[PDB]
Amino acid sequence: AENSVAYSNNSIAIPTNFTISVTTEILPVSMTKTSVDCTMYICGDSTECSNLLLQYGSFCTQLNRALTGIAVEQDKNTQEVFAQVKQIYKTPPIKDFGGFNFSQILPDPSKPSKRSFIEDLLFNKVTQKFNGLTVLPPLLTDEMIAQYTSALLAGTITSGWTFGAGAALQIPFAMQMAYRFNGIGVTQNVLYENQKLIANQFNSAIGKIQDSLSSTASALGKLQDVVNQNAQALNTLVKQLSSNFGAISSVLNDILSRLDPPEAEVQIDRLITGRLQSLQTYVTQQLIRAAEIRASANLAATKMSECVLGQSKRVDFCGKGYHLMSFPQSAPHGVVFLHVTYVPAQEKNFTTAPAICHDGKAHFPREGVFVSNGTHWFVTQRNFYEPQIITTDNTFVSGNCDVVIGIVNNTVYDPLQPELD
């Protein structure tokens, strides 16, 4: 869309309202751990073919060590992200957080595999050892991964984020958000005077999350691509066991049954050379693909230690807006964050001035903007409209009214003088 900001010197725009937003972010942490024994493709349980394979040095030893290396690594990708809490915190049995709901993120007192009401959708919106193929089971089962996320959730919604410093320190959630207003340059009095409105706005944002996930065609496409590439790079590998590669036949048992040793060693060696090259290629691609997820499981670990275990000033990483907090949710092969941010709205423009000329001395605001609605000047914080009368208590004097350009003559109220009189 086309925009044109009404820019003009001495004119500013200051918001008068805010809208809580919750935007999901999806990151893949690990992929499937498949281990392939190189001897069972090339030979396929044939003693007379194994001897021909050992003539090729130690190729079959590297292709077993390489895949094992990118299988132990997948148990470190999960460890870095979730296993970041020494203890396992729990929510109190009586949930009174001042209005905030959290019933869609907390574990379910229901059917087993105690996931949240949202994690149930994530584990349902995404939904073998035949010839040398294996699929090793992950060290961390989904029943315990869902308990790291519960432990992180059971502490972030009840004790701030003093976890990043050591001991857990209790603090009511109604006074957590007051702290994190001060992080983004908003006075904490905005929360308390708008607590009921803010709680309803936050609750509605969460309610639209599962609606935006289940109803939409595919929001988990990032996690589906990893599955659609592993399962497809394996079909292409398996389907290469039915190619002649220049031999009489593509099945090894039917060559030894109609050929003598001295002339069958040349037909086998065409399959051995072809199949070995048809296995080195896929192992190489897995090494590249594993590094892609390795760099993605290191970013998901950073987001867990910054957006979840604290408040981040980094722009457009923990959500699009002014970050407040995040809630981690498990996934079949990844992790989902729910960034909570403020988006200013309902802005109105006014006329400004860099300084106030009173008593022949320049005045500058401490934390605020000199703002005028047309006749009277006020001081407001830069992120929310709250006008206050200019006073010596919220302004400081430094300079003279002949250097800076743009001063407006106005009186600075002094509170001691009328009390003295």
Partner 1 sequence: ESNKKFLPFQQFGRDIADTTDAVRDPQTLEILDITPCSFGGVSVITPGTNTSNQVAVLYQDVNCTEVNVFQTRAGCLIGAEHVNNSYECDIPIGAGICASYQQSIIAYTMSLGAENSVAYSNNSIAIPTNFTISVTTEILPVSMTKTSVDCTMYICGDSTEC
Ligand X SMILES: *[C@@H]1O[C@H](CO)[C@@H](O[C@@H]2O[C@H](CO)[C@@H](O)[C@H](O)[C@H]2NC(C)=O)[C@H](O)[C@H]1NC(C)=O
One residue of 12, 23, 32, 40 binding partner 1 per CB under 8 A: 40
> Smaller CB distance to partner 1: residue 30 or 383?
383
Supply the minimum distance, in Å, between the C-beta of residue 348 and ligand NAG.
6
C-alpha span between 33 and 241 (Å, rounded): 22
C-alpha span between 76 and 29 (Å, rounded): 10
Cα distances from 217 to residues 177, 212, 223, 231, 335, in angstroms, run 34, 9, 14, 21, 19
275-304 footprint of ligand X as x/- string (CB under 6 A): ------------------------------
User: Binding of ligand NAG at residue 349 (CB under 6 A)?
Assistant: yes
Number of CB atoms found within 10 A of residue 12's CB: 16
307-346 footprint of ligand X as x/- string (CB under 6 A): ----------------------------------------
User: Binding of a second copy at residue 362 (CB under 8 A)?
Assistant: yes
Enumerate residues 252-271 that contact partner 1 by CB under 8 A: 252-253, 256, 261, 268
Supply the minimum distance, in Å, between the C-beta of residue 274 and partner 1.
9
Query: Hey, CA dihedral for 256, 262, 267, 271, is it positive or negative?
Result: positive
Enumerate residues 215-254 that contact partner 1 by CB under 8 A: 222-223, 226-227, 230, 234, 237-239, 241-242, 250-253
C-alpha span between 417 and 410 (Å, rounded): 17
One residue of 17, 62, 103, 236 binding ligand NAG per CB under 6 A: 103
Strands 356-357 and 408-409 turn out to be parallel
User: Binding of ligand NAG at residue 406 (CB under 6 A)?
Assistant: yes
DSSP line for 313-345 = --TTTSSSSEEEEEEEEEETTEEEEEEEEEEEE
Q: Which stretch binds partner 1 (CB under 8 A): 47-55, 100-108, 130-138, 308-316?
A: 130-138
Q: 140 touches which of ligand NAG, partner 1, a second copy, none (CB within 5 to 8 A by kind)?
A: partner 1
Six token digits for residue 38 = 């190189």
One residue of 178, 184, 256, 259 binding a second copy per CB under 8 A: 178
Tell me the three state secondary structure of residue 66: helix
Single-letter code of the amino acid located at 365: P
Q: How far is CA 145 from the centre of its chain?
A: 16
> Smaller CB distance to ligand NAG: residue 137 or 261?
137
Q: 375 touches which of a second copy, partner 1, ligand X, none (CB within 5 to 8 A by kind)?
A: ligand X
Q: 101 touches which of ligand X, ligand NAG, partner 1, none (CB within 5 to 8 A by kind)?
A: ligand NAG
> Smaller CB distance to ligand X: residue 15 or 138?
15
Supply the minimum distance, in Å, between the C-beta of residue 50 and ligand NAG.
29
19 within 8 A of 322, measured Cβ to Cβ: no
> Smaller CB distance to ligand NAG: residue 100 or 161?
100
User: Binding of a second copy at residue 274 (CB under 8 A)?
Assistant: yes
Residues counted in the chain = 421
C-alpha span between 330 and 120 (Å, rounded): 10
Enumerate residues 10-69 that contact ligand X by CB under 6 A: 11
Vertex 196 angle, CA 308 and 108, to 5°: 50
C-alpha span between 289 and 300 (Å, rounded): 17
Q: In what helix (H) or strand (E) does residue 225 lie, and over which residues does it extend?
A: helix 221-238
Six token digits for residue 255 = 């060559």
Rg (CA), the chain: 32
User: Binding of ligand NAG at residue 399 (CB under 6 A)?
Assistant: no
Instruction: Tell me the residue number closest to ligand NAG, measured at CB.
Output: 406
Enumerate residues 284-343 that contact a second copy by CB under 8 A: 284-285, 287-288, 291-292, 295, 302, 305-306, 309-310, 312-317, 320-322, 341-343
User: Binding of a second copy at residue 155 (CB under 8 A)?
Assistant: no
Query: Backbone breaks in the chain (C–N > 2.5 Å) follow which residues?
Result: 127
98 within 8 A of 172, measured Cβ to Cβ: yes
User: Binding of partner 1 at residue 297 (CB under 8 A)?
Assistant: yes
Question: Which residue ranges make up the site for ligand NAG (CB under 6 A)?
Answer: 95-96, 101, 103, 349, 406
